[PDB]
Amino acid sequence: TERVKRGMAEMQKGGVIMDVINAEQAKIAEEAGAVAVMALERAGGVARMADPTIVEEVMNAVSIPVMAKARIGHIVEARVLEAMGVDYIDESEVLTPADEEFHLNKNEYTVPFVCGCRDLGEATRRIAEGASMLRTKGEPGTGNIVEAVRHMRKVNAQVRKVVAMSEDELMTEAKNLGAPYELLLQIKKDGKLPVVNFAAGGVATPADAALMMQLGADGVFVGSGIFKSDNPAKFAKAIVEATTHFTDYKLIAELSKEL
Amino acid sequence: TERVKRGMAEMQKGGVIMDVINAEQAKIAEEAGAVAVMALERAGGVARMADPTIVEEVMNAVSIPVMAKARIGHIVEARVLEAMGVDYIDESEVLTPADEEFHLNKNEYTVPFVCGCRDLGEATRRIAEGASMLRTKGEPGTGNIVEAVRHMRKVNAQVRKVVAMSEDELMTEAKNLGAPYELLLQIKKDGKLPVVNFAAGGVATPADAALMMQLGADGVFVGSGIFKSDNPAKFAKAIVEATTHFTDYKLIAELSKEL
Amino acid sequence: GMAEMQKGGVIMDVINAEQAKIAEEAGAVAVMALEGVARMADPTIVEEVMNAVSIPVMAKARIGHIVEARVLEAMGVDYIDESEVLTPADEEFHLNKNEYTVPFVCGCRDLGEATRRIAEGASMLRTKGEPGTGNIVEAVRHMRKVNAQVRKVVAMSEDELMTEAKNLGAPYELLLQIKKDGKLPVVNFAAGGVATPADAALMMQLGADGVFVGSGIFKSDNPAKFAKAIVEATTHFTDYKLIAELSKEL
Amino acid sequence: KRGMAEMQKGGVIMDVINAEQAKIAEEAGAVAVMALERGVARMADPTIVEEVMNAVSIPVMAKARIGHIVEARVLEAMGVDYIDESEVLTPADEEFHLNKNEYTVPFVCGCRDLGEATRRIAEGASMLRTKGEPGTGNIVEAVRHMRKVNAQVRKVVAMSEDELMTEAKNLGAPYELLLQIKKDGKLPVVNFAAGGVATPADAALMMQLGADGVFVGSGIFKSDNPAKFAKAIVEATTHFTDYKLIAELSKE
Amino acid sequence: GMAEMQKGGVIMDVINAEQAKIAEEAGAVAVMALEGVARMADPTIVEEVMNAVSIPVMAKARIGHIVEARVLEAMGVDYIDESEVLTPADEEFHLNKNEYTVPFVCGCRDLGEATRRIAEGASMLRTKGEPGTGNIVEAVRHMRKVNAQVRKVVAMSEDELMTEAKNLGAPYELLLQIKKDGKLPVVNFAAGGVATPADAALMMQLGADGVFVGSGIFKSDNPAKFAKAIVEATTHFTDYKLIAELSKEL
């Protein structure tokens, strides 16, 4: 059921999801206040689904939801993670795509998916294929927030326009966006996207995390840079507190010290 | 209600709809076995909605459904015909378009609409805007069946492909067609379009009418050429009998004589 | 303030006293006095119309023609239309309407053009439409474009407005004020190609503040009746039973 | 279907619009006639076709627009001997030709090259002709088409068999047909000249270039003596190397 | 008929007797004996593999290399792969495989290529994939393309098939037979880039008749175990619990 899958996804709203490679990192994230973890194994090589042993370790390490990545289009990687009992699958462009023409028919799965998007056409096509959660594609591993900004702004600007525009112009808008019409109509009616949309890819600092929230993100994904710090527990907790208290500029100043 | 509007439209299936300019022609069409008539007023000029007096004359002349044309996008021509009690509105590219960017939001009307289409993307966008019936755009006033053939074949070929293709390829197909995704999915599930699709524009002979049926049309629209004959009643009845008995080649030979 | 007084109305092109009186009698809110290079009308025609009615009288000046506009002002016209239908006198600069006492109407096709005309001092706008074709399609295009762009401006994040202004070629402070007011600061009428009662009502349904119609009124066998039909359809633009009856015999 | 087409081999087929023209053609030695009505050009009034069929004892052909299923089915039902799925009529389908395989009546189709030829055959054509250039009286395009087809067959028949798929891909020819052409040393159906034959010398030229026969148009009946002209064309086509005879036929 | 016997199986690239036996023991349906210009393998290697197992043995010939293919045939290989991974000997013409007694496998990327290879005499097909990258994306592309094109051919109106054949560059009579049979006349295996148990099962889910895998099996610390994991995932391609367990430690 759609309502279940989305309701589950919606639970994470206002929070931070962290990339973790083992039980130790998993525990640190949970302890810092992460609402979930993304289990990762992460040179010209092919990036695939993680060794299921790693995903299993992470699932055993924490009580918060655990996510993992499947290559775009990789039906079997996705069915495997589903059978393993992960809480969410990220059909991720950061892994090497298995299918360069067709995304997964996520509607046919019981596990909820997260997908990336850069604009409202991509967002609505991912939702129509059955995505229960969205995120910016951003710019992974660069530490530059600029693409996550661009994507969150684009999606949000396009939503505002759709909500405000004459209803009889929406088919032309759907055609121009490559958006499924019925989803745009429902967006107009609801005044919002039907799923949460997190920032992801390039969130490097407390100020970055708070910025994405200020731009309308529903939460934040952060990467392994957390555990490149001299004190991952402090850094992880700093990202959590900035994402939550995203208008407390005195706090965020303090949190931004010694990075 | 959608189901009502479509069910009404679906009633005309297997039949001939004829363009008529007055009560006399209206009566001849009905008498020849037409399932409906299209009331028409039809030089570099602007072609608009018919004088309501003409539409009224036609509605008074016959007991079969009466259709009339509104310019593409002309909200008020359409609301006027609706208020007048016509049975269907044809939002027609044969009249001079009032809006070159946006079609009518046909969903907001109580009267059913017919729209033209040339391919499945156009068909599904017209349906999504609320069209209850479709037709080929054909090539009006030329008497050349070639475009009606092309459009009926295109729509039908694209439907067959959609019905047969892997479900997980349908979003890519929707994107390529500019088709609303949920409508394609439902087409795949139903094995057919959700509304009837008539041939229109260039049906000149009994053999033409039977051809469109053989190509999968749900019925035929014919133009004023009927009443350019020496014996409109005979010609109109010939078109009706060919459309119905579209595999009776001996009959169609006979009907094709003295044209 | 005087322009907004006309809102919901019909303005009729008239060439003489007789036409002008008919227009007034039909319920026109104003008349546009009218008369190869197309220039300002003979002042004699404009004065004939001014003396013939009590409703506001407008007249046309060539784009950029300072002296035509100052002459009309001196004549006591109520509004000047700086009109692209006359032959432009200046192809690079519009009039600085801020420097005149008489209010101006200008044409526009999009919100950039609208706000530039306003910033130059326009007190009233209209679509450029497509004059003398009887085809409503361009008026529809222009009215939809301006209105669509306004809705987006009203809805969008304030911090994205400067990019929008730069994209539109809009004066930023007008765009900001549009966002704050929820609308344009001046009325925007449909013009160019309104041929039928249904067309007039259509432009109102699309968000127009009123309608300019042309000399085709007087081409009909019963001008007064046709003039009245346009007025009644423009006012009562959602009364489809009325509009049906008015659409008969044109 | 093919053996019947082949019985026309070496003869002249004439366009005729009525029973009189039809009788003249038969009497002149035509092997068959093409019933015509002669703007959208469609299947002829069946009345005309029936008049022609009733007028002569030689085979009667008629035309159907390209892709017009029901026109072709109607002609079939009327008992015509052959249908010409003809580009000289206004095409009813600009994307797809008739599935001639599904009919009992034999079809003739036009072609300009061996790729077209084999595609038409694969769709079920029982006879081919050049497309030529109808109503110009200019033989040049019939020459082009007959030469092209025949040159491509000579090459196919002579070439290395392991090179035939590349040839088929290049021609857009169905591979099995090309392979059988190579095996047989020839096309599997007769191929007539059509479109622009104006003089006896033209008729004989087409045969000299390898045509199996000749289609000719209404120009025969535009002449001062149709019977004599028609006979001239028949004789020049049959006696296509008799240059003294063709000389005499070419007078007046 | 002999090719179809392999359906559902795994074929493994092997360079010597030892690898060959492991492959056989793992449940391979056949082995591909393998050894700058890349040519036919030293016949010594091919014979070593033929003597080492009882399952079918395939070997590679350069595209168009008549004599390499005749030599392999004379040697008693069970199948010849006319392979684009070797350096083509003829860049214009493939082998006339119709003239050989031994069955051939050929690569294809679309249904045009598939039917041309078949018409030349291929008894078996595979994707061209993207060899030695471990990236499954091109095998996915090719298998999806061929299968999508077949479904369309099977569904489409028969009278539109000649346009389709011309568009595809497909021999018409094969396309017609595909429509009638509902499928290709030969098996079509995935090849080039299958790296993991999940990849192998994915290609089966996409409609492949079987899977070719490369020397990466023997790069693992436990070849026999890995070989078995690929076999079991290819057969039991919808058992996600098994496939999960098999995906561990690669």
Ligand SMILES: [Cl-]
């Ligand atoms: Cl996309």
Ligand SMILES: [Cl-]
């Ligand atoms: Cl990142």
Ligand SMILES: [Cl-]
């Ligand atoms: Cl469209």
Ligand SMILES: [Cl-]
């Ligand atoms: Cl028509």
Ligand SMILES: [Cl-]
């Ligand atoms: Cl400007």
Ligand SMILES: [Cl-]
């Ligand atoms: Cl006008």
Ligand SMILES: [Cl-]
């Ligand atoms: Cl062709």
Ligand SMILES: [Cl-]
């Ligand atoms: Cl000719």
Ligand SMILES: [Cl-]
């Ligand atoms: Cl090829």
Ligand SMILES: [Cl-]
């Ligand atoms: Cl490989």
Ligand SMILES: [Mg+2]
């Ligand atoms: Mg858990």
Ligand SMILES: [Mg+2]
């Ligand atoms: Mg950059």
Ligand SMILES: [Mg+2]
């Ligand atoms: Mg009635």
Ligand SMILES: [Mg+2]
């Ligand atoms: Mg054309």
Ligand SMILES: [Mg+2]
């Ligand atoms: Mg006054």
Ligand SMILES: [Mg+2]
């Ligand atoms: Mg135009």
